[PDB]
Design a protein around this ligand. Structure first.
Ligand SMILES: [Cl-]
Ligand SMILES: [Cl-]
Lengths: 342, 342
């Protein structure tokens, strides 16, 4: 339902620039705009809202060129951190606000509102004012207000920041359940790759104002298109190695390098913490020495320092929470990896 | 090096109250004060700093009663979000600030500063001003300034908020490496249980101004002292069940209940997402129906809805990323659990 055609919006300061972007978001899809602060992800969200206008290129929604139409003129609803519930209005009135302008007759406006309130578990709070509710409940009300008018597109601008970690997690699960229910098209901004993998159908990875990759969680995690995607999605150990005899040396192992990479050129080897296995050994021949471990529930995190001074992060099964002690010497076993040209 | 003795500081509004707390933090230990917003965790950090004073009880540091001593009078350094590097001073001068007041002669102040700068990889930035550095580098400078005077205690008040997820993670790994190096005693505030498990030696779980538990990451995760600890550390599915015939029914399984829990009383069953196994089945006898799955790298997250309408979150191995499709019917297998009295 959304499309950017060679959209460009450059800021002389760098951050926030969008550098000639094009993509197509499917109807009913939930897309996460994932990137570093100032990578262009927020500008893109704002370009879809109409809060910003492209210097070149166009924005389409529902096959409808809306590049020059204001926010009010687009079929999109906003759930922004920039927002604020009407503090002196009850939950009921905050939510009816949108229907209030579509000239919907009283009876139908009412049924629409009651509909949204029960769906979102806010019936017991209809006659309450925003200050009487928890932040969590206030976000449910904001999503109800945005949805009332039946928007075509739903835009989220990190509305859950300044929230406690646990409530933030319950919220994203709620927003997802609501999305699947309302069948709308949703786009959200985030600098947290875990959040993107968790709720998005597809992820748009942004970097320096360009789209690095646009794919499913599995796609961006298992088949990263660039070193940036490889290093920004999931966790990773990233190091430089020089190619010699068609291979690089990683932990006493020769990793073959694609023949298209020239002898003597440098590459980044990317190895995920879970993809490295540790086995006891003597300092004599050991690859690394354990700095320390941390039990994280589903797995134990183990940091080790190689002979060359590289500190690697390795994830071992919970069933090994007590296997590696500080100072201990160990052998490494890289099992999966990525290799990208520097 | 730190001890609270029946410390009490109550706020008429609830949030921030500390309700009769006592604990002992070991020398060279890194402790995480983990709790919901307003649970008393920040007030406690401030009580150690001297920024706040207890209404009752006392605070000890290094076996030294300091309850009535100001921040300046305590052997503690601050790395707060409330802070701000001196923008018009170079990195070198920002860091020498502390030594500057211990009347340390020029030569020795200089060697101390150069010492800290090289340790923290800020030598190439000595003659730069704060605005010339990334936020990440600015935090390294703040930690250097706090450490210059050789504080006994190091206090962190969520200094990494308003930071990108990836840099926040690199920062905590750095703060930990520094801590292990300087051998100081450190306390940090956090509402993120994952962060606490990752870097703390022991975690102080706060709730409504009381200490729920004080133990190692493994302790609080595997042996939660209360339902709150069980539901606040790690991930969990939490549901109520009534006891009948000395057991509760969870997914077609009878979980025995400790004989000390009376017939007819209600309990909370806590089951971690990773501790539930799914196997195909007919709707006829199936326990749940898959709402959806999300690939998260090391594991696939699967949400299912039971016949009774409970939506459970289950974590299945990456090796099963494509095994469960929406609508699909399934059988559940709870393998580990906790049971606490409601
Ligand atoms: Cl941006
Ligand atoms: Cl607090």
């Amino acid at each position: 339902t959304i499309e950017f055609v060679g959209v460009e919006k450059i800021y002389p300061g760098g951050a926030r620039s969008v550098r000639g972007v094009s993509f197509q978001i499917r109807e009913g899809e939930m897309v996460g705009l994932l990137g570093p602060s100032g990578s262009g992800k927020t500008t893109i969200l704002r370009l879809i809202a109409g809060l910003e206008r492209p210097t070149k290129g166009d924005v389409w929604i529902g096959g409808k060129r809306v590049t020059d139409l204001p926010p009010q003129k687009r079929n999109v609803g906003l759930v922004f951190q920039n927002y604020a519930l009407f503090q002196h209005m009850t939950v009921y009135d905050n939510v009816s606000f949108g229907l209030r302008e579509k000239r919907v007759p009283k009876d139908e406006m009412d049924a629409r509102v009651r509909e949204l309130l029960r769906f979102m578990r806010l019936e017991s709070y209809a006659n309450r004012f925003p200050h009487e509710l928890s932040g969590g409940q206030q976000q449910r009300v904001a999503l109800a207000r945005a949805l009332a008018p039946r928007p075509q597109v739903l835009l989220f601008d990190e509305p859950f920041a300044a929230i406690d970690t646990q409530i933030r997690r319950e919220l994203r699960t709620f927003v997802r359940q609501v999305h699947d229910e309302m069948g709308v098209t949703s786009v959200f901004v985030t600098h947290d790759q875990e959040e993107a993998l968790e709720v998005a159908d597809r992820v748009l990875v942004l970097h320096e104002g360009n789209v690095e990759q646009f794919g499913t969680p599995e796609e961006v995690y298992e088949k990263p298109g660039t070193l940036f995607v490889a290093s920004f999605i999931g966790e990773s150990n990233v190091w430089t190695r020089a190619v010699q005899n068609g291979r690089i040396e990683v932990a006493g192992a020769a990793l073959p390098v694609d023949p298209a990479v020239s002898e003597g050129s440098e590459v980044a080897v990317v190895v995920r913490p879970k993809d490295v296995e540790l086995q006891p050994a003597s300092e004599r021949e050991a690859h690394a020495q354990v700095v320390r471990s941390a039990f994280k529930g589903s797995y134990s995190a183990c940091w080790i320092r190689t002979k060359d001074g590289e500190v690697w992060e390795v994830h071992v099964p919970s069933a090994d929470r007590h296997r590696w002690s500080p100072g201990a010497w160990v052998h490494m076993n890289v099992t999966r990896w990525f290799i990208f040209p520097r």
